[PDB]
Design an enzyme around this catalytic site. Structure first.
Site, PDB file in Angstrom:
ATOM      1  N   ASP A  96       4.151  13.209   9.578  1.00  0.00           N
ATOM      2  CA  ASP A  96       3.847  11.676  10.667  1.00  0.00           C
ATOM      3  C   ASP A  96       2.766  11.035  10.088  1.00  0.00           C
ATOM      4  O   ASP A  96       2.123  11.723  11.184  1.00  0.00           O
ATOM      5  CB  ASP A  96       5.218  11.687  11.517  1.00  0.00           C
ATOM      6  CG  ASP A  96       6.459  12.146  11.626  1.00  0.00           C
ATOM      7  OD1 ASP A  96       7.744  11.678  10.462  1.00  0.00           O
ATOM      8  OD2 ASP A  96       7.089  13.116  12.039  1.00  0.00           O
TER       9      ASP A  96
ATOM     10  N   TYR B 180       0.896  -1.053   0.295  1.00  0.00           N
ATOM     11  CA  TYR B 180       0.210  -0.111  -0.006  1.00  0.00           C
ATOM     12  C   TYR B 180       1.080   1.365  -0.444  1.00  0.00           C
ATOM     13  O   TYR B 180       0.566   2.195  -0.457  1.00  0.00           O
ATOM     14  CB  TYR B 180      -0.584  -0.207   1.459  1.00  0.00           C
ATOM     15  CG  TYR B 180      -1.819   1.339   1.130  1.00  0.00           C
ATOM     16  CD1 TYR B 180      -2.723   1.385   0.599  1.00  0.00           C
ATOM     17  CD2 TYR B 180      -1.510   1.930   2.196  1.00  0.00           C
ATOM     18  CE1 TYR B 180      -3.531   2.878   0.973  1.00  0.00           C
ATOM     19  CE2 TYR B 180      -1.411   3.175   2.535  1.00  0.00           C
ATOM     20  CZ  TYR B 180      -2.661   3.769   1.809  1.00  0.00           C
ATOM     21  OH  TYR B 180      -3.297   4.827   2.096  1.00  0.00           O
TER      22      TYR B 180
ATOM     23  N   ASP C 215      -9.978   9.483   7.865  1.00  0.00           N
ATOM     24  CA  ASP C 215      -8.671  10.641   7.413  1.00  0.00           C
ATOM     25  C   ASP C 215      -8.531  11.410   6.596  1.00  0.00           C
ATOM     26  O   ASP C 215      -9.183  11.989   6.436  1.00  0.00           O
ATOM     27  CB  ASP C 215      -7.527   9.855   6.430  1.00  0.00           C
ATOM     28  CG  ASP C 215      -6.336   9.922   5.341  1.00  0.00           C
ATOM     29  OD1 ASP C 215      -5.794  11.097   6.559  1.00  0.00           O
ATOM     30  OD2 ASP C 215      -6.019   9.755   4.902  1.00  0.00           O
TER      31      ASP C 215
ATOM     32  N   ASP D  59      -1.648   4.432  10.076  1.00  0.00           N
ATOM     33  CA  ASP D  59      -2.806   3.897   9.277  1.00  0.00           C
ATOM     34  C   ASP D  59      -2.511   2.929  10.723  1.00  0.00           C
ATOM     35  O   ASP D  59      -1.652   1.598  10.910  1.00  0.00           O
ATOM     36  CB  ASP D  59      -2.450   3.408   7.736  1.00  0.00           C
ATOM     37  CG  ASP D  59      -2.410   4.918   7.436  1.00  0.00           C
ATOM     38  OD1 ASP D  59      -2.437   5.944   7.541  1.00  0.00           O
ATOM     39  OD2 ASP D  59      -2.865   4.439   5.633  1.00  0.00           O
TER      40      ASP D  59
HETATM   41  C1  LIG Z   1      -3.739  14.285   1.910  1.00  0.00           C
HETATM   42  C2  LIG Z   1      -1.856  14.442   2.310  1.00  0.00           C
HETATM   43  C3  LIG Z   1      -1.476  13.342   1.472  1.00  0.00           C
HETATM   44  C4  LIG Z   1      -1.594  11.994   1.632  1.00  0.00           C
HETATM   45  C5  LIG Z   1      -2.090  11.924   2.749  1.00  0.00           C
HETATM   46  C6  LIG Z   1      -1.872  12.208   3.928  1.00  0.00           C
HETATM   47  C7  LIG Z   1      -2.386  11.589   5.216  1.00  0.00           C
HETATM   48  C8  LIG Z   1      -2.279  10.523   5.790  1.00  0.00           C
HETATM   49  C9  LIG Z   1      -2.138   9.632   4.881  1.00  0.00           C
HETATM   50  C10 LIG Z   1      -2.984   8.296   4.948  1.00  0.00           C
HETATM   51  C11 LIG Z   1      -2.670   7.658   3.693  1.00  0.00           C
HETATM   52  O1  LIG Z   1      -2.906   6.261   3.925  1.00  0.00           O
HETATM   53  C12 LIG Z   1      -1.824   7.848   2.515  1.00  0.00           C
HETATM   54  C13 LIG Z   1      -2.198   9.385   2.302  1.00  0.00           C
HETATM   55  C14 LIG Z   1      -2.191   9.792   3.208  1.00  0.00           C
HETATM   56  C15 LIG Z   1      -1.563  13.748   3.611  1.00  0.00           C
HETATM   57  C16 LIG Z   1      -2.393  14.745   4.275  1.00  0.00           C
HETATM   58  C17 LIG Z   1      -2.744  15.934   3.636  1.00  0.00           C
HETATM   59  C18 LIG Z   1      -1.978  15.640   2.282  1.00  0.00           C
HETATM   60  O2  LIG Z   1      -1.333  16.517   1.412  1.00  0.00           O
END
Ligand SMILES: C[C@]12CCc3c(ccc4cc(O)ccc34)[C@@H]1CCC2=O
Ligand SMILES: C[C@]12CCc3c(ccc4cc(O)ccc34)[C@@H]1CCC2=O
Ligand SMILES: [Cl-]
Ligand SMILES: [Cl-]
Ligand SMILES: [Mg+2]
Lengths: 126, 128
Positions: B100, B16, B40, B103
């Site tokens: 940082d 992933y 998220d 997940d």
């Molecule tokens: C969306 C994002 C890029 C990817 C991303 C973010 C935050 C949590 C994540 C969790 C994921 O499992 C995969 C990608 C992201 C960022 C928050 C702001 C941004 O530029």
């Protein structure tokens, strides 16, 4: 609920208490009706006495060390997640275990739920 | 596959991150169950289903270059779940920043992601 900055401080304090092995101070951090799932996938432990027994069994001998391996991730709804490493001795084999804890705090800054992610794939012989 | 073993969880969650890093939206969406949910950041309302999940990733990854890499091992359970720490690098105010994130994922009986929860807030954003 605790702010994101307050969650970071509480979860770091918890690791500090594990590392020095103060079982009573750890148990005080938990809410009356808290649950612990450690490892996640096993049935929850409920109640102050049972939570104390779990930490007594895990940390009792001394010789457990714990330290953060990266920053605490905190939300705005009183929850957080943190990566850390536990160092212990398993029948004469010095070992390390990589863990992530997820915690949900209540309105008093106590731990309402704790879920610890790890399995044998996260164990290493040192 | 079936419900992933702990070892399989580690491999799926590492893949992933590789797909986020390269920005393959279709390959990401295929990893999710058809009726999956994404939270998220955790604390915001869940997103439901592949159409909405695709839209979310295309908004997040479809623009400026995003890089993602694990910052420690995947932690996996025996009931098809895991958690991982990683760092996302992107741009903010024309300068590089880093975020940082942790997940947490639960997989179903077909090896697909049923729920994803992403833990982060502005306290996890850094610059300079
Ligand atoms: C969306 C994002 C890029 C990817 C991303 C973010 C935050 C949590 C994540 C969790 C994921 O499992 C995969 C990608 C992201 C960022 C928050 C702001 C941004 O530029
Ligand atoms: C219990 C334990 C020591 C401490 C510990 C373990 C696993 C997850 C933990 C999560 C915590 O938040 C605090 C302590 C532990 C180890 C598994 C085997 C063992 O001896
Ligand atoms: Cl980290
Ligand atoms: Cl780590
Ligand atoms: Mg299904």
């Amino acid at each position: 609920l605790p702010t994101a900055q307050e969650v970071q401080g509480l979860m770091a304090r918890y690791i500090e208490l594990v590392d020095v092995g103060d079982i009573e101070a750890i148990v005080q951090m938990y809410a009356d009706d808290a649950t612990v799932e450690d490892p996640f996938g096993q049935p929850p432990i409920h109640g102050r006495e049972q939570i104390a027994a779990f930490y007594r069994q895990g940390l009792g001998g001394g010789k457990v060390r714990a330290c953060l391996t990266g920053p605490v991730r905190a939300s705005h709804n009183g929850c957080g997640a943190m990566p850390f490493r536990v160092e212990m001795v398993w029948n004469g084999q010095p070992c390390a275990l990589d863990v992530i804890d997820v915690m949900r705090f209540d309105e008093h800054g106590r731990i309402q739920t704790m879920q610890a992610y790890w399995s044998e794939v996260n164990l290493s012989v040192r």
